[PDB]
DNA sequence: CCGCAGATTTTTGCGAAATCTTTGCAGCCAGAATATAATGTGTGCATGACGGCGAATACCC
């Protein structure tokens, strides 16, 4: 905080204090939205032919 | 003071090996790959000169 501080440790703790801890199912929900995003990007790559041609070349 | 002997000088020759690059090997080493249970906490704070001094906010009049 603004306490005439000059230690990066202190305000790093300040930064980490803003975000609240997660639960077991919270991690699963966040990973689920991550999986939705990666499936979206996989579909986007899917609609692109040339990347698939390159993948088939390596196969 | 001159020509040959001892000493010194001239010339041709072979073995040896080391070095530079390439190839095979072994110790060194780097990244890539796998899914054990663990999230607001630690932490060092070590501490008794003395004089000068401006800068930085506070507070009375």
């Amino acid at each position: 905080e603004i306490g005439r501080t000059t230690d990066p440790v202190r305000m790093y703790m300040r930064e980490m204090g803003t975000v609240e801890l997660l639960t077991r199912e919270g991690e699963i929900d966040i990973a689920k939205r991550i999986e939705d995003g990666i499936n979206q990007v996989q579909c986007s790559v899917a609609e692109y032919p040339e990347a698939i041609t390159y993948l088939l070349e390596q196969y």
Side-chain angles (χ1 to χ4, degrees):
Chain A
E1 322 181 285
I2 315 163
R4 56 163 39 76
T5 52
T6 181
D7 197 351
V9 176
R10 302 306 202 286
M11 52 86 58
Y12 192 38
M13 321 275 278
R14 311 320 167 245
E15 281 192 296
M16 61 79 71
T18 60
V19 181
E20 169 183 340
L21 204 45
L22 316 165
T23 48
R24 170 68 187 119
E25 83 284 355
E27 301 168 308
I28 313 179
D29 299 316
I30 304 170
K32 164 65 172 186
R33 74 169 70 102
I34 294 167
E35 278 199 354
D36 292 14
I38 70 187
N39 297 303
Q40 285 162 33
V41 307
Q42 287 274 253
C43 287
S44 296
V45 170
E47 279 181 69
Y48 183 44
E50 300 184 278
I52 310 304
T53 67
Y54 193 91
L55 186 48
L56 292 168
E57 278 173 0
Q58 299 296 101
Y59 166 73

